[PDB]
Amino acid sequence: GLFGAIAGFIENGWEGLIDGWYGFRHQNAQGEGTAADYKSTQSAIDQITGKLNRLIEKTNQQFELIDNEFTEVEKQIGNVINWTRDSITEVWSYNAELLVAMENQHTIDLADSEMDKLYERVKRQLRENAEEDGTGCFEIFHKCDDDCMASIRNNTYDHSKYREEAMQNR
Amino acid sequence: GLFGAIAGFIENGWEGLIDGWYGFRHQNAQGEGTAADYKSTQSAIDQITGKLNRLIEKTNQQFELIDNEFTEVEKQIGNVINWTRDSITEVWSYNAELLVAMENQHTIDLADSEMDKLYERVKRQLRENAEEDGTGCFEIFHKCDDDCMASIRNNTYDHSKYREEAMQNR
Amino acid sequence: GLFGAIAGFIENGWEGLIDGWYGFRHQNAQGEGTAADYKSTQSAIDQITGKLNRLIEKTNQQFELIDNEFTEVEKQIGNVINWTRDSITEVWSYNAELLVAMENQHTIDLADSEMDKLYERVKRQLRENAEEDGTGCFEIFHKCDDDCMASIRNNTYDHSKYREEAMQNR
Amino acid sequence: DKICLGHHAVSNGTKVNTLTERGVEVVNATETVERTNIPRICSKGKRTVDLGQCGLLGTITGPPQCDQFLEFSADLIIERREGSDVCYPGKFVNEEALRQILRESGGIDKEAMGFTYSGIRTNGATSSCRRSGSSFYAEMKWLLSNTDNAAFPQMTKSYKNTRKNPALIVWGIHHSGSTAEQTKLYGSGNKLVTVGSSNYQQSFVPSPGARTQVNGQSGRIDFHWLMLNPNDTVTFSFNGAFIAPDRASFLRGKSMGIQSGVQVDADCEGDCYYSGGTIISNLPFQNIDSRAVGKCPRYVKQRSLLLATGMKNVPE
Amino acid sequence: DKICLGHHAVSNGTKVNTLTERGVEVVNATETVERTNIPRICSKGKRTVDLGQCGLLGTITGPPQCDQFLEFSADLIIERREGSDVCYPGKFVNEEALRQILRESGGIDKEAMGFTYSGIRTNGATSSCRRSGSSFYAEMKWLLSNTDNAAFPQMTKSYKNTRKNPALIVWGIHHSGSTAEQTKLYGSGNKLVTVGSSNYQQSFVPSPGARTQVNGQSGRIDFHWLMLNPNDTVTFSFNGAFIAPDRASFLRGKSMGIQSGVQVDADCEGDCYYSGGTIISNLPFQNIDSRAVGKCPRYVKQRSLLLATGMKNVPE
Amino acid sequence: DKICLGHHAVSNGTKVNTLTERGVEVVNATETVERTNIPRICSKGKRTVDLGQCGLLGTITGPPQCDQFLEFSADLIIERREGSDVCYPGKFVNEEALRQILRESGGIDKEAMGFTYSGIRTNGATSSCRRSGSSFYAEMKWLLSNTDNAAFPQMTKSYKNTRKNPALIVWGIHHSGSTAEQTKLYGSGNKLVTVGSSNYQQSFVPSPGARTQVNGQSGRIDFHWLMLNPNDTVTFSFNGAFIAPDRASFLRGKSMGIQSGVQVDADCEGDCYYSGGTIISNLPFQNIDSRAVGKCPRYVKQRSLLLATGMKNVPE
Ligand SMILES: *[C@@H]1O[C@H](CO)[C@@H](O)[C@H](O)[C@H]1NC(C)=O
Numbered sequence A, B, C: 001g002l003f004g005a006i007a008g009f010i011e012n013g014w015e016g017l018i019d020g021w022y023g024f025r026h027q028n029a030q031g032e033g034t035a036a037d038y039k040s041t042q043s044a045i046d047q048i049t050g051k052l053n054r055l056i057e058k059t060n061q062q063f064e065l066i067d068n069e070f071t072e073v074e075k076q077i078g079n080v081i082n083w084t085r086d087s088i089t090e091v092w093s094y095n096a097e098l099l100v101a102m103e104n105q106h107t108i109d110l111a112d113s114e115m116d117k118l119y120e121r122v123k124r125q126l127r128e129n130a131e132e133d134g135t136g137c138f139e140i141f142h143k144c145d146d147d148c149m150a151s152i153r154n155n156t157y158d159h160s161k162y163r164e165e166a167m168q169n170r
Numbered sequence D, E, F: 001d002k003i004c005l006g007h008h009a010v011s012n013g014t015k016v017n018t019l020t021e022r023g024v025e026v027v028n029a030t031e032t033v034e035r036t037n038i039p040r041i042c043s044k045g046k047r048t049v050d051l052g053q054c055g056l057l058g059t060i061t062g063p064p065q066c067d068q069f070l071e072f073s074a075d076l077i078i079e080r081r082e083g084s085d086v087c088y089p090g091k092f093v094n095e096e097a098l099r100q101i102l103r104e105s106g107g108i109d110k111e112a113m114g115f116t117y118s119g120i121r122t123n124g125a126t127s128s129c130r131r132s133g134s135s136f137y138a139e140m141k142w143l144l145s146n147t148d149n150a151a152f153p154q155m156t157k158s159y160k161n162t163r164k165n166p167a168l169i170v171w172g173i174h175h176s177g178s179t180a181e182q183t184k185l186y187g188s189g190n191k192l193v194t195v196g197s198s199n200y201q202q203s204f205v206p207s208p209g210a211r212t213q214v215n216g217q218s219g220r221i222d223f224h225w226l227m228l229n230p231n232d233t234v235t236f237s238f239n240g241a242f243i244a245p246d247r248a249s250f251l252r253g254k255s256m257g258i259q260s261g262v263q264v265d266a267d268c269e270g271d272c273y274y275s276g277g278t279i280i281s282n283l284p285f286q287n288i289d290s291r292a293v294g295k296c297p298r299y300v301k302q303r304s305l306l307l308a309t310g311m312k313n314v315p316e
């Protein structure tokens, strides 16, 4: 939680959000709706994908036998070979464990960031017509019919339309 | 300072804060108090601990002699051995230096993050009853008795109680 | 875009900003001006510099011949040598590609952070005298003559001077 | 009144490790270390050779077993635990260097060395190299004295590699079971075999005497081999105990040798092989065989290293 | 009026490096590269062997020094700079291979090879292998002709490994200080020693002649060794210059060998050893000995690499 | 009314790779993998030696080619494809070990070994080692019998290293083109050469016989070499076929050897050399020669790895 959204100021995830990774859940006069956000969901996805594309990789370098499983090579040479190979195992095993931990840290942090980024986008959309409840909700100081909610999701909410009324609920 | 709080908009640390890593310092009618925040302090600590737990590690791989300190092995073989070992020294020396620098970068940034996260938590708590002084203070537009400050630290500050008065100090 | 500013809520860069990396572009009564911000620009630069300093590095370890280009060494030994060297080539090639990708990720994110940090600095400066347009602009609810703009850039904008008026444009 | 934003979760996510914390539950993860075998050498697409009873070095000298393989072609060569390079008891000097050379050679193209012999037996044979009863290494002439105890003529033979690649030249030194049998086969008095080119230069004395009864023989054959450069020439000086090459070997193209204990299968396609199968995987790591060969995922100690592919998982 | 939040600081923090900046001051840091020795081989918990004067290879042949160690048991074996494998001057063929084999063997269990000899001296001795004045390698019979210049009988001896593990077999070839002393010990005319199993097959001629006066001798003993498989058999053919095995050696369990210059200590417990001590540490890196052995921290060039364990430090 | 903040951009930025995305356009980047050669051994600052026709091992034995180089001094030594260690046909036992020893030696300081000979020829020569017509390895005396077929006296020679460093000692074994020419040069009957110190101990028999006609000779010289410790002593026992050292070699200081195919240049300064030039670069990686030597950038498979040095680039 480098960004403090996921597993942070948002209390927990929505096991119902089967539509995408991020989303809005509104409550108005008409009832209550949950919708997923394509842009943020898709970005988080694009990025994790990119990680995969990079990590699912084949090096075009062939390695051949220097050992012999059937008739064991000379002891000193085979011992040097065993030592080199074991040392190399140590390096890659480390490289793998580190790579995976670092990548998981960054993946999680990245998702947290995408959440924050979305929240802050909506916050910016509202401007002065809503206040932050601190749990990842915006209390809207005007009346938000289902078309309004929709407008907030498709980023077409004009704060000017509702400024007077909302402000007036000072 | 990926987050700009520590060594950022907060001017500097408090050599007096012997209680924890993060904390509130209030000034009200009754005087002036400093207290530490358990949750944020404890999170930063938990994480650095986890780093340590991972980095203080023993590999269960034995390595034996292929060399000889007393009667030097054959030159060509011992030269190949010296070359392999020196190359492997190069790799681990790099791996160590990089690991440490990357881990220090992330540690610092993570602390910065925990500071921001706390600040923003209080901001969220206060809602509309306070304004941001930009130095990492909140000027409260109402009267904050020691019980009030306490409530802000134990997260029990109800902004509703003071909204009228604070707002009214427009 | 870990921070969502660069290639984020700011729509795009300014091909005209030849002064520095970050900057303010204001529009007032008297016209329209663009200026660069020394502090943020210089910080992003200081850091990428630090990366370079670390990455442009020479190891003071000499490596000598164990091979022979003219008269090829014994097959088994030279095959072991070829295998060790090729394995080490695999490790460094990986270390290099990873180092570069990780460093580019962090560099980008760091710049994004510096942008955010600057924005938020100005936001903090304004306090209550301006509102966030969401494109990385501050609409100022008072009159900002060129000296005022200047004051905002050299960090000498006193919000007290303009609070009454700006607020009053509620 | 209100609009809230959130993120998904699942009831049962999977745990992964991070820089900072062990076993954090995230939504989805994927495996990074391959553990999945295919108990069959995936030969499809490449020309394969299974040697079975044949030993690899044997494909040059040509004892009974390797009669199938005296001129083989390959892309993939397969050694088997039961393989043997030998019929009449003996080791190859520098055996493994040669084995490695052969495993990458794409097969061998054999060719006569034009050796003619005067006033001696060319047809030495034994009850170990069985075919028509007693015989010998189909590429080696067992040079013997004209009749028992007849002093073996001091001879010299010679061969020029007249091709663009180099030539593999094998010869053998018969160490007799007793001083009696040596002088029975080659005549009394000292014996030497000298071998020289421009690269090579070495020489051999036979060592008669009794060793353990491997294959019903007590004496042994020391096999020696050299590489012969284009335009170069080999010379043999000898007066006994010399098992002569009849043909020389040339390397065709390129290949890869593996030591397998499992079936072939030209249905599936592969590129990483290990003694007990094939490893087909996209994963950048494997935990199967340290020693596996071909184009391979890096070998690591770790059974599993799960790579998160989803956000922190925080259920209700 | 106001509530402020902050973080701690200390007047004197410590500097660490980051991806981006060198020597940034953070609150607390911890060391990551171990530099801390213990000038003593931490032997506690494991059965130790200090050889001192004894040389490791010696424990097979058994010169004076190694009489303590002819049947030793170990978990940890310790070579000392003064150790010696030899009393009568001579090298071991493939010495270091063998040394490595012994350092991991858990000790040796010796056993008679049942060699009986007819009509020759079995009791050859020398003023170098001191005990009761002159003696020999307590595991080797110095076979000599029945009296001076007496032609040494052509002999053959044999031994079957009848155990589940393999058997270490050492023998020696005496190279006499002069042709005179050779024919004085074994009689005139050529001499050969042949050695064969199924694995092995090799042979030896003595090389009489004068070399530098090591230990007051001019001639040398070449020690040769082979490993003998379960069910297998060794055969020796010879007529002189042959230093015969009396017993064969078997490997007990498992162990680790170190080359130390420092005292033992069964008070402290350890797992990483280097020539000048023991390394007990949790740290994942060390800067002590490139060559250190056991279960060890990775060796690095760097004296110190400080790992920050606290936030950026910004004092007043 | 308004103040806006932003960042710069450029129309044409450059693409780099990140953990998350391939080929993202950022403002400025810099190259990280060096590809830039200098077709010339940058010798300035360091004392150089180009051997050309001389072979490195030759600088000890001293055939015609290496007469320039019998006592050379260097910091950087340079082998050339045409170099040769030999005039009269023959190999060096353990050649490459020695080559490596010499490439780091800072040069050689030669010194007489005080060998005197009685009642034999000291001045053997041949039509291969051309100078004044026929000659020999300017550091080796070709010891010959006093006249044809004259039995070669059994001799012994000896040398003590009386310096603080060790001493390089080379000697040779002449394998004659025929048994006839051997007994023509050294007399009939067996021949042995034994060589011993405290470190070393080995011996040689000549192997007469005909090999391929390299340099117009059919027999060969086996060169052998040993290292001789301070205070130590070498002894040679022999009765023919022995090519004697006249002088011994000592190692001056320190140097580095390279195998180059390109010109020297004492104008430019360097520290990383590869067969086809010099690599001067700050870059931490190179794609030029796997095998390059000196103080070098790590070798990597990748042609280019661009490291972003500027922000994400977003033009209008
Ligand atoms: C190398 O390790 C393998 C483990 O599979 C072992 O079988 C072999 O004996 C080792 N080689 C030697 C001789 O040290």
Ligand SMILES: *[C@@H]1O[C@H](CO)[C@@H](O)[C@H](O)[C@H]1NC(C)=O
Pocket (backbone or CB within 6 Å): B075, B078, B079, B081, B082, B083, E290
């Ligand atoms: C190997 O390097 C060590 C130093 O670590 C040195 O003491 C030794 O002489 C070298 N030996 C060989 C043959 O590499």
Ligand SMILES: *[C@@H]1O[C@H](CO)[C@@H](O)[C@H](O)[C@H]1NC(C)=O
Pocket (backbone or CB within 6 Å): C072, C074, C075, C078, C079, C082
């Ligand atoms: C090692 O590789 C080089 C080129 O990469 C090749 O020329 C050489 O033949 C190889 N060595 C052996 C003996 O395989």
